[PDB]
Symmetry: D2
Subunit: 474 residues, 4 copies
């Protein structure tokens, strides 16, 4: 049980009810996190709004100082946190430690990027002569209270990516980690507690995403909603937000276009690492291959042999393929598998499920009439759709309701660049698997994949507004 507590207004607090967390792989009970009540949610928010003024009052240098202390601590206790996070979400140990490190990176980067964010002075004379002596001194300002909600696959990394950019600007935070990953989320909160930030500046909220979900978003105290999860909730949040600003990173069905002149080995390598990373439980993974027929056979054989080299097993053993987050999920994946299989798809690797451990499947001959060709599995299954023209590949790629990223494997760069302009995605990688790729670059998604632009700098601009003082020079 252990009984983890929330960090609220400078204090750790338990609740009348709890939620027991178990290890997706072994089944062991890791502990229990609070099941907050709306009354409690109200005190978190009240504490934050109360403390916002004086946080804003601090200097950027001082706020950046705290953020650095937090990241330092994270790096210190990276193995401790990694060991648990690994267990809580069935992620390989080493990989789980990496998540803690990349979080420290994002926190530090966000800290330094935040104190170098500047304003602008505008001339009335640029618009009309009569206003030549009129100027506008424009400076940025925080939006207020920011609600951050991280996903199960990156409960820590995708939490700091919201927390740090928000805090450096002068906003206050209310962190709501995923229930499955709430211990890890609270382990992160420990870092913010030790760093010593003023009481009320950083707060956590745990509990039944059903019991308190809509409540926390609809609350009038929240000025900005920063979320990462499924399209379904993202959509609800967009409506519950009203006219309040939001940042949403929803799902994705990232394609990998392979032209006739591509480096099939370089391509097979990138597609495997992208498609099967974390058992396909990544929104930015390569979810479908649109390969030109003439090179389909050769490419597919490479991918096939490469799949046969992926280790399958337990987190503690750093297996490439580990048990999916839960049964509801592994079942869903199983559905997509069958449907494709039934419709004629060709599994080049063995279809087999051990509990919630689904072995990596390579389906060749997948078609547009299969669910696997469009629906986001979030499991180790990769469909290969054979096209006969770059024109068709673009058409099929754009058809998807999603638009996170895309990949183009070719040697003709001017072409790759031209295709890239046509793909309805946020980012196109020319010769490399899709990845968030250094958190300094902008990250965004077209269509149902989200709302808003991410990346340290863009996150900071998003969660800030502008105040403009205009005066006349004598």
């Amino acid at each position: 049980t252990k009984q983890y507590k929330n960090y609220v207004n400078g204090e750790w607090k338990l609740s009348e009810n709890e939620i027991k967390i178990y290890e997706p792989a072994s089944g062991a009970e890791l502990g229990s996190v609070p099941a907050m009540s709306t009354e409690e949610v109200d005190y978190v928010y009240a504490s934050a709004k109360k403390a916002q003024p004086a946080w804003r009052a601090l200097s950027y240098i001082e706020r950046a100082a705290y953020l650095h202390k937090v990241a330092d601590i994270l790096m210190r206790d990276k193995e401790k946190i990694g060991a648990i996070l690994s267990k809580e979400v069935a992620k390989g140990y080493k990989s789980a430690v990496s998540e803690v490190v990349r979080t420290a990176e994002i926190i530090n980067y966000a800290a330094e990027e935040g104190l170098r964010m500047e304003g602008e002075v505008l001339e009335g004379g640029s618009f009309e002569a009569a206003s030549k002596k009129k100027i506008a001194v424009v400076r940025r300002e925080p939006v207020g209270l920011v609600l951050a909600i991280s996903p199960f696959n990156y409960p820590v990394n995708l939490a700091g990516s919201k927390i740090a950019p928000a805090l450096i600007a002068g906003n206050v935070i209310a962190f709501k980690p995923p229930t499955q990953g709430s211990i890890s989320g609270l382990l992160l909160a420990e870092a913010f507690a030790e760093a010593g930030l003023p009481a009320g500046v950083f707060n956590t909220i745990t509990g039944r995403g059903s019991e308190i979900g809509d409540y926390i978003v609809e609350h009038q105290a929240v000025n900005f909603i920063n979320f990462t999860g499924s399209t379904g909730i993202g959509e609800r949040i967009g409506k519950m937000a009203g006219m309040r600003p939001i940042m949403l990173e929803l799902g994705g069905k990232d394609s990998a276009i392979v032209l006739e002149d591509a480096d099939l080995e370089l391509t097979a390598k990138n597609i495997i690492a992208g498609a099967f990373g974390y058992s396909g439980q990544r929104s930015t993974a390569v979810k479908r291959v649109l390969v030109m027929e003439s090179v389909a056979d050769e490419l597919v054989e490479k991918i096939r042999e490469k799949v046969l080299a992926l280790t399958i097993g337990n987190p503690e053993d750093d297996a490439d393929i580990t048990p999916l987050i839960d049964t509801k999920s592994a079942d869903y994946v199983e559905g997509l598998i069958n449907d494709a299989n039934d419709k004629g798809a060709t599994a080049l690797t063995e279809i087999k499920r051990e509990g919630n451990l689904i072995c990596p499947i390579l389906f060749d001959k997948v078609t547009t009439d299969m669910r696997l060709a469009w629906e986001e599995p979030f499991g180790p299954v990769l469909p290969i759709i054979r096209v006969t023209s770059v024109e068709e590949a673009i058409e099929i790629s754009n058809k998807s309701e999603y638009g996170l990223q895309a990949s183009i494997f070719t040697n003709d760069f001017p072409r790759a660049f031209g295709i890239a302009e046509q793909l309805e995605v946020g980012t196109v990688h020319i010769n490399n698997k899709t990845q968030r790729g250094t958190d300094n670059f902008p990250f965004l998604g077209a269509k149902k994949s989200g709302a808003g632009i991410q990346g340290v700098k863009y996150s900071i601009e998003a969660m800030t507004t502008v105040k403009s003082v205009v005066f006349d020079i004598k």
Copy 2:
């Protein structure tokens, strides 16, 4: 009747049903505008989405070229359009002509500002050594189809402010003017038709905002909703938008803080011109004076004498105070007047209504318990709230549900600048009435006053997204 038609996919079209427009002041019938059906709305949208690709294909120089042609034509026919616009919304002739001119200005400014909007190149090495040879070539892109909805008080000016920034970037437009101001809105469309933009690039939609309102917003073809109107609809739009981007300029209750060291004459002059402009039918007008008691009496007397100099009458006569847009409105204002009056407010000028022509009223001694102290009238009524400290004035100012702009009349600039940081508004004017002030400066509103940042440059960034091509340098 005349029977004005919509501009759809390069053609002017009537509908089975029409809506007759009458002059707010005289009552004369100006003509009739189409009452579209959802079937028709579907063709407007279908035409636009069909034409978007090739508009995006053009060069910025070519798109900017068309926009300049439009503005040229507007300047040419400024009297023609002004004469009607003046009649349709009871605006003074000269002033109505100014609206047409300022629209040409915004269109030209948006055209040149648009072709100088550039991208950025990012270094993988700024984040992590291992990615030093990885770069991100980031360029802007249009969002697609943009729905522009202008208000009755600026059916033309607040239409071009959305249309031009949107088109230069590569977006297509579906213009929906207010029913009262739909002839003027269609007069503007004539300019876009003569300019010769490709068919489907610019389109108009007219009809019962009730019969087709939600339909046009909720339509899945619309990628961005740019609106200007009441808070009530703005709120509906924020929900109907879902997770699609929006720009909303709602209401306002702009305060004018007058400190003990202010230039009472300079102040009285600015407050009058702000408060009584267009009979108070401006979202950015000075709607409440928070004056320090020690100078309240003197200041109020100046304002009083100045009010007595405002001409009252008909549009064609360029009267300062003209008939309110309609009866529903003049009634609402009458309500606020009585309530304040009943509660003890002191009308320093005569309360009198002739049809829909309400004479300018100056209410001294207004208090927090009066509706006039918080609700946006949109009529010629100005409340004077006497405070006893800058601290109180800030408190009362921030209490309002609105946050468009504010004014501070003082000589202590460092103070004015400090106060400005505390006011929950988008812009603070130090010694001058609130105004949009040269459409190149950013324009935004805090709280219920809106969502998004305006001003030519900011409008262009808002209705654009970003595509990021990442590659590795060998």
Copy 3:
């Protein structure tokens, strides 16, 4: 004779002495331009400094207005000016007209780019907590009087490229065109005169570059020296400038690296148009080919056949190859030709000179020991240096004392991009002949090729300074 006059302080003035100008090709006398005295140079400068304050006082919109009027006029009289410019510097008619048009473009572009140049607001708190309430409002300002000196090959285009960016910012100008091209330079001044700019804002200075050269540069009234010419003068100017800012575009020996995978036809086409443009009298022309041995033979044959298609003759006949600016020049070129020839080079096309008309020569087998391999001819002679490795080509390319631009013809873009980082030039073109390429892009040169960065935006920043007002917010 005609007897052209200088435009000084709003008036056209002749001088006691004149300089007669003759047509490089026919020999006819075009007319005569003033041979100013230092006394007269002092009045030009005194007029400018006197008028600077009130030009700065105008609004950007007003200054941009004048600049547009100038460009309009240029476009109007493009044939008139083109006809003479063509004769004065032995440039093809059509091409000379193009120069006038591109000048109008640069003037308009500079005008609009100039009124959108903005300032910045900085936070004391970004550096140290104790200064959190301290801010710096930074705005640009003009440097004052700018001296612009254009070259003979672009007496008009390379004059406006300095004049427009300088004037829009608030600086005043003293234009000194090349003696051979001074009629065309004065023809441009006519445009600035008709546009009606205030007296003293724009002024011309003509005369013996020997008699008045150093005098005009060393004068204490000049705040910035913007020059385009030979390395020799550029160097003198750098010393005579002292610690005053300068912009220098000197010579160049641009290489064109051709890798084994290049499109030899696309390459031969680009190299010909670059190398033989204006008879090689372009600083940005392809002056040496560093081709990989394996493709040297095939490539060279294409270039050879293509050279044989270049028309040779008179300006009025739009010949590809026209008479060189003068005898001193054609002689120098003849020297380089012989030396190479003597040393073993292989002329694949006929060596022949008719007066000052040297026919286009293609020298294969040129080596490092030849003058043609390093010295800038400024005549229609192209050396082909055969290398055996990209490593060698880079080495040979960088050896040159020049560094304007370079070209890489290959299909391996990541490679091209990697090579580009190693080349000591200002710009690298991947698959295309070197060109200034749209005057919006930055233009600069490494090593002896210059000092400063050009391109409309960069030119504007160069000829401006910054004023920073710092104050404390209460």
Copy 4:
């Protein structure tokens, strides 16, 4: 003697000849620094140019890493270094330690500011339709070898301010500290040595500024000259630089304009701290007061009483006023004192010199005909010039050959802002003594006060160039 060595290509080296350094106050021998020969200077430069390529090859993150290590070390040994620096240049102990701290700050700030410096992508279509598919990927690059020369009053602070911004960008350094301050300069080099930067990246050059001065600047290996010292040498450097880029911070005679509505107490406080800081041995000190007659008497009395409170004595005792750097200097100051005195100035405080310790003098009634009214003393002497109009004060202020900074003490900010536009300085402080003010703000000087813009960000842009790769999208 100790016998300090230079840090050259990763090694510490003595020279055949040395220069013995003595403590300005006590006279004690601190030690001896090398007196290099041009042969040695050639090896420093050869080492640097040799190592430049691979330093540029590193990632920004790695270069920033080294810079942070250096600053950490400086903070560690701040007392050690402070103790000596205090002795070497007669600076108060505590103050000397502050110099070491502020250096660490600038080094760290420069490190983080450097890795967030980005490029831009330009559109051919912004200029001309035909080039719409042409784009320019512009990225920054280092200039190469940078020569940094620090002053005696900041041998360390004004060295790091050049070193850090230069190194983070990819340049190599050759540090030349002032002879009087060369031990401290070499103490700084120790930090760069311990940090472990690659050999040849950072180097020091010491020796007779006469014996090797021009040699080190004129050397063809140096690509950029960054200097801080007297106007005399600055001017020589501007000529010896040729057309190579430079950064020069020369002298100053900063005025403090005091209007009739100023806070005389707040003003007297700021003027004393600025004027008498480091015995007036600061280029940014308040060197002349231009006060409106009506408040001259009252203001002057405050300043007078405040002067009487300044401690006078030895460095180790943290005296406000310590011995001037040397006799040649104290003599020069004595000259200015007498001249003014002879001409009628009125010393309100005692004129007295003890060796090289000149007591702080306040001269009222100074006039334009006195040397003290224009010449930069660099000693504790403050002239009060009484004016009768803001117009006159501006006139007198601008008359000076210098233009570093200025101060305006008034309550009328719009006026202060208007005056500021007229003052020929780089920075204007409204109500506060002149100061460099947080090294993140831009720092520059008008007229003979320098060439180039400083401040961490601006320093980085200055010592960098731009490479532009242009290509066509298919």
